[PDB]
Every structure is written in structure tokens, then in C-alpha cells.
Amino acid sequence: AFAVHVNMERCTGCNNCVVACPVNALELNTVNPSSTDKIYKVINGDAVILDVKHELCAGCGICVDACPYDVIQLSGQPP
Amino acid sequence: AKGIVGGGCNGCGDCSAVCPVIKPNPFEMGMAPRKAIYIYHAQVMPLIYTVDFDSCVKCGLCVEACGDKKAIDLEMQDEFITVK
Amino acid sequence: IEAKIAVNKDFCILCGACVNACPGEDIIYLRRDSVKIKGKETDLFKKIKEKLFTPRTSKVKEQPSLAGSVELKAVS
Amino acid sequence: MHEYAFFLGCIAPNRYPGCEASAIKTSEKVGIKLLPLKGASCCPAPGAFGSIDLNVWYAMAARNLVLAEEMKKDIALICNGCYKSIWEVNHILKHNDELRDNVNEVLAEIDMQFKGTIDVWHLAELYYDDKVCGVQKIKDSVTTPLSGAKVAAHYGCHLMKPKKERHFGDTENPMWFEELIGALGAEPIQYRNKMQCCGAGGGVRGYDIVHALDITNEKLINIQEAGADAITELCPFCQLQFDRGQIEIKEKFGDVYNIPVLHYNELLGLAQGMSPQDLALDLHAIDCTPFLQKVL
Numbered sequence: 001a002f003a004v005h006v007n008m009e010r011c012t013g014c015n016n017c018v019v020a021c022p023v024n025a026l027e028l029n030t031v032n033p034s035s036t037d038k039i040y041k042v043i044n045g046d047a048v049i050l051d052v053k054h055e056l057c058a059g060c061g062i063c064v065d066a067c068p069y070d071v072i073q074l075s076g077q078p079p
Numbered sequence: 080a081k082g083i084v085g086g087g088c089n090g091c092g093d094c095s096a097v098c099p100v101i102k103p104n105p106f107e108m109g110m111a112p113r114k115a116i117y118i119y120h121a122q123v124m125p126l127i128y129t130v131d132f133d134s135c136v137k138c139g140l141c142v143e144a145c146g147d148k149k150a151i152d153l154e155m156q157d158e159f160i161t162v163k
Numbered sequence: 164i165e166a167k168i169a170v171n172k173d174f175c176i177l178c179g180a181c182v183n184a185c186p187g188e189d190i191i192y193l194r195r196d197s198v199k200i201k202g203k204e205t206d207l208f209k210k211i212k213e214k215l216f217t218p219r220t221s222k223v224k225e226q227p228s229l230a231g232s233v234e235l236k237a238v239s
Numbered sequence: 240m241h242e243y244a245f246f247l248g249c250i251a252p253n254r255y256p257g258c259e260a261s262a263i264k265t266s267e268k269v270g271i272k273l274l275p276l277k278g279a280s281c282c283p284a285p286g287a288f289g290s291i292d293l294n295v296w297y298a299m300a301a302r303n304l305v306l307a308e309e310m311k312k313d314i315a316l317i318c319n320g321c322y323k324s325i326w327e328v329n330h331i332l333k334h335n336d337e338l339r340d341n342v343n344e345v346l347a348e349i350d351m352q353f354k355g356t357i358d359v360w361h362l363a364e365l366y367y368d369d370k371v372c373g374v375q376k377i378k379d380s381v382t383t384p385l386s387g388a389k390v391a392a393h394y395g396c397h398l399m400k401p402k403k404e405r406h407f408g409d410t411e412n413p414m415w416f417e418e419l420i421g422a423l424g425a426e427p428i429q430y431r432n433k434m435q436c437c438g439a440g441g442g443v444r445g446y447d448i449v450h451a452l453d454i455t456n457e458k459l460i461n462i463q464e465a466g467a468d469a470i471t472e473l474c475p476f477c478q479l480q481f482d483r484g485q486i487e488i489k490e491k492f493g494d495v496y497n498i499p500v501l502h503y504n505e506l507l508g509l510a511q512g513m514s515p516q517d518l519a520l521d522l523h524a525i526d527c528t529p530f531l532q533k534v535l
């Protein structure tokens with residue numbers, strides 16, 4: 001239930017934070033999908049986090065490790 | 080009254096000698112440690128050794144230290160009395 | 164085709180890091196049955212046994228009021 | 240992109256133009272748009288002009304306010320003294336009816352009225368606010384780390400004091416400006432009596448230069464003892480004092496510090512990659528070259 005922050009100023013729209021998030025990958029890549037909500041979607045060229053109320057993230061670091069030009073900061077402390 | 084003939088609390092101090100929790104003493108404005116089972120100072124009038132239930136971990140060492148006196152009831156609850 | 168993940172019960176120590184880390188919904192099911200101790204026992208230790216021995220599994224979309232920490236699913 | 244009228248008083252445009260240039264560039268890089276103010280003048284400088292006549296102080300500050308009122312925009316500032324004049328006259332004339340009346344019948348001779356419809360902000364206050372660009376956005380915009388530099392902050396007096404008249408919180412040991420310098424990557428250091436006046440306020444800079452320089456020298460001694468490599472500031476008065484006054488201290492006394500004095504907007508430009516030539520660091524009395532060697 002952590003909080004992710006995306007630096008819009010250096011986001012290129014690469015979409016490798018959307019493809020690599022394992023909560024996004026739940027809908028289409030799971031047998032009998034449990035939850036179909038998504039943290040990121042690239043609207044107007046930058047990654048927007050729809051997870052406003054910080055309910056779905058799991059601090060996995062797959063998205064921080066994925067962005068090619070580090071731009072996603074993961075906060076492990078309560079918002 | 081509850082039936083323990085041997086008595087209740089005589090203020091020996093074994094309970095606080097064995098309690099492992101350590102918290103600030105409000106009587107000493109926080110400068111000094113006191114266990115979870117405690118008295119403010121040695122000159123308190125009811126020398127009866129309150130248990131601080133917000134900080135007790137129910138380790139049960141205090142009851143073993145108290146022994147046959149059986150003064151410690153870790154499950155006690157807030158009783159209500161009406162007085163005219 | 165293939166499996167995507169599996170475990171070796173010979174080496175799993177029933178810690179719980181896997182459950183605490185998985186972002187999935189209920190991929191993992193953890194339940195401990197007996198802790199092995201030396202030293203006799205305590206009422207506190209019986210409470211702690213009861214707390215450690217409740218089955219658990221992952222969860223997506225936990226409550227926001229506790230944002231910044233983890234909450235698992237209580238399995239009946 | 241939030242839009243503000245950019246007041247731009249006397250010292251930044253006419254002595255330290257790199258300050259205003261970096262202000263516009265860095266504010267645009269973060270989500271802020273700084274629009275020129277059309278025919279603004281000296282905010283009647285609170286010391287040297289308020290000491291003479293409070294009524295003409297009110298009238299000139301109100302004229303500056305009604306320019307941006309006609310523009311229908313919120314003032315943005317980069318000077319603590321200009322903040323005092325503009326913001327405080329705005330606040331006083333938003334609540335005092337007889338003073339509104341007096342200023343309005345003075346301004347009616349130039350076809351111009353004050354109604355009190357806009358708000359006044361300091362640029363560092365905007366950089367700190369979370370609705371507008373926040374500390375995190377500043378960190379995002381920073382592209383050159385400026386690491387390994389000890390930087391001493393001078394808050395000034397007219398931004399934060401008196402706290403019964405402002406809204407910035409504690410005046411005894413604020414840390415907000417230290418967070419903006421920490422965002423840039425430079426480590427802000429703490430020195431003795433960090434909230435002391437620089438000595439240039441109230442017209443003392445002009446009336447008694449030795450007295451003002453002694454007040455400044457107390458600060459410079461504390462800052463050198465701490466070990467600063469530059470002094471950030473949010474006021475062109477204080478920058479002028481700390482910059483010229485180092486030269487006047489070197490000549491009137493025998494004290495040498497050679498500590499560069501930079502506005503926070505100049506440091507923000509350096510962090511965001513602007514060039515020293517584009518910042519006009521050659522227009523300062525005290526050479527910035529050692530600090531540039533350290534942070535570049």
C-alpha cells in the first residue's frame with residue numbers, strides 16, 4: 001500500500017513501467033484474474049499513477065528497476 | 080475479600096525487580112526509569128504498586144515474583160461504582 | 164508449457180517474506196503449525212503461538228488508512 | 240503552468256540581472272510562468288522611503304499593486320524588502336478602510352483605483368508550496384548535483400518577520416530555506432546567530448556604513464567559522480550588502496573572506512545547468528570561481 005512518485009519532467013513515455021508492474025500484469029496474464037485495477041497508464045506521454053489512494057502497490061521495485069532513465073522514486077515510509 | 084488469605088500487596092518490590100519493561104516515570108517528569116509495574120516514589124501513601132497496562136506485555140514474571148501473595152491480577156478491568 | 168513459480172518444501176522455513184512481498188492476490192498460502200522451543204512456556208507465549216499460527220495469504224487493494232505498510236488476508 | 244506577474248524591483252534588474260534571468264528560466268522549467276509587470280517602479284523601499292513618509296509609501300506600493308490588479312494576476316517577488324512593501328501594503332489596505340480611502344483619493348489624480356483583489360507571493364514561497372512547484376519538483380528539475388558544497392543560508396528579516404504579521408511560522412530556527420538548498424544537492428550548514436540582520440535594512444546602509452558593515456561582519460565571521468563556501472540569500476538588498484560590503488570591509492577594516500554571495504535563483508540556475516556567463520556571475524564583487532570549481 002506504498003506510494004510511488006513519477007518525475008514527469010524526465011518521463012519519456014517508454015511504457016516499460018506499465019508493462020512491468022506485476023499489479024498491472026494481473027488482468028491479462030493470470031488465470032481467473034483477481035483484481036483488474038492498474039497503477040500506471042501513459043497519458044499524454046508521461047506515466048500517470050491511477051493508484052491515487054495508495055492501495056495496490058506492493059513495494060516490489062519491478063517498476064523502479066524497469067524505467068531506463070531512473071525517474072520513479074519508491075517511498076517505503078507511510079505517506 | 081476475593082478469598083486470598085495470604086494477603087495482597089505488601090510493597091516488597093520483587094515484581095518491579097523482575098519486570099523487563101522500562102518506561103519514563105511521570106513523577107520524575109520523565110527523567111527516571113520505572114518498570115511496567117511500579118510506584119512513583121518510595122513514599123507513596125497507598126504502597127500498592129500499580130500495573131501500567133498500556134505498557135505491560137503480560138510476560139507474567141511479576142506474578143511469579145509475587146508468589147503466594149497473589150496480589151497481581153493481569154486481567155483486571157475498569158470497575159464502575161456509583162456513590163451518593 | 165511450464166509453471167511460473169514453485170517452492171521447495173524441504174528448504175522453506177515458513178518465514179513469511181514471500182507472502183509479505185508478493186504483489187499478487189492469493190498465489191501463496193502460509194500456515195505454521197508448531198514452533199519448536201526450549202524454555203517452558205508462558206501465557207504470553209500461548210498468545211504469541213495463536214498469533215503466529217493463523218493462516219495468511221497476499222492481498223491486492225488493502226485499505227488506504229494504513230497506507231505505508233502491509234496488510235494480508237485472513238484465511239478462514 | 241501557473242502564471243504570476245513578476246514585480247522585479249530595483250536591484251535585481253539594475254545590478255544583478257542574472258538573478259532575474261535565472262528567475263524566469265528556472266521558474267519556467269518548473270511549472271511557473273513569470274509575466275513582466277507593465278511599468279512597475281521601485282516598490283517604495285520600506286526603509287529608505289518608509290522612514291521619510293508612510294503615506295507616500297502607501298501610495299506608491301498601491302500603484303504597484305493596481306498595475307497587477309489591472310493585469311488580473313498575482314504578484315511574484317524575489318526580494319524580501321519588495322515583499323515587505325508590496326505584500327504588507329496589500330494586506331494593510333485590504334483591511335483598513337480609512338487608509339484605503341486616503342490612498343484612493345491620492346490615486347484618483349492619476350485615474351487609478353485600489354480594490355484589493357490579488358495576492359503577493361515570494362518566489363521561494365512558491366517553490367516551497369506543494370500546490371505550486373514543491374521541493375520534490377525542484378529536486379526533479381535539478382540536473383547538476385552541486386554536491387560537495389557547504390552553503391550557508393541567510394533568510395533576511397522582511398520575509399519572515401514579524402511572525403504576528405506573516406504566515407511562515409517559526410522565526411527562531413526555520414529550516415524551509417535549508418530544504419530548498421538541500422534539494423539542489425548542496426548541504427546547508429548551520430552557523431551561530433543565523434537569523435541575524437545583515438545590517439542593510441532601514442536605510443542604515445546609507446546613513447552609517449561603518450555600523451552596517453560591523454553588523455555584516457559579525458555574520459561573515461560566523462559563516463566563515465562554520466565553513467561555508469557560498470551564502471545563498473532571497474533578497475537583493477542582502478546580496479548587495481554581503482557582496483559590496485565584503486569589499487568595503489576589506490578596505491575599511493582588514494578582514495578578508497572571499498565568500499561568494501548568490502541568490503537562490505542563481506543557485507537554482509546553476510543546478511538546472513545554466514552557464515555562469517548566462518548567470519552573469521562576473522557582475523559580483525566577490526569572485527565565485529572557487530565555488531564554481533567545487534560544484535563543477
Ligand code: SF4
Pocket residue numbers: 004020021022023024039056057058059060061062063064074186
Ligand atoms: S512497486 Fe511493484 S506493485 Fe508497486 S507500482 Fe511498482 S511494480 Fe507495481
Ligand code: SF4
Pocket residue numbers: 006010011012013014015016017018042046047066067068069071072
Ligand atoms: S518507465 Fe520511466 S520513463 Fe518510462 S513511462 Fe515509466 S516513468 Fe516514464
Ligand code: SF4
Pocket residue numbers: 087088089090091092093094095127128144145148149150151
Ligand atoms: S505486587 Fe506482589 S511482588 Fe509487587 S510489591 Fe506488591 S506484594 Fe510485592
Ligand code: SF4
Pocket residue numbers: 097098099100114115116130134135136137138139140141142153
Ligand atoms: S506481566 Fe507486565 S508488569 Fe509483570 S513482568 Fe511482565 S511486563 Fe512487567
Ligand code: SF4
Pocket residue numbers: 170174175176177178179180181182
Ligand atoms: S520466503 Fe519464507 S516461506 Fe517463502 S519459500 Fe522462502 S523461506 Fe519459505
